[PDB]
Amino acid sequence: YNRLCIKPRDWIDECDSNEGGERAYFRNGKGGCDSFWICPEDHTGADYYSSYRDCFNACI
């Protein structure tokens, strides 16, 4: 399940701006992209969408 575009893991989506890592952009089967913050914690490489518009155009 779940393409790169879709993160299976709520991964502490609360390390907010400055309180956290980069913003990263994903897209669940609701009807929009959802950006989260990575935190320094899940330094998973994060080969993810950087630009909002990429997540949006790629997956919407």
Side-chain angles (χ1 to χ4, degrees):
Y1 185 53
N2 269 13
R3 219 70 64 180
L4 299 190
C5 188
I6 327 188
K7 176 71 150 180
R9 268 169 32 83
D10 57 44
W11 80 343
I12 302 185
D13 274 349
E14 44 190 50
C15 298
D16 201 1
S17 44
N18 204 92
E19 247 181 25
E22 303 295 349
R23 247 176 308 171
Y25 290 80
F26 291 66
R27 205 294 242 202
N28 51 42
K30 294 177 59 181
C33 282
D34 272 295
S35 4
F36 25 53
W37 297 98
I38 311 195
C39 216
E41 216 170 302
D42 203 61
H43 267 218
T44 187
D47 172 9
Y48 297 145
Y49 300 111
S50 35
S51 41
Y52 170 80
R53 195 77 157 288
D54 271 67
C55 177
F56 194 84
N57 295 357
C59 285
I60 304 286

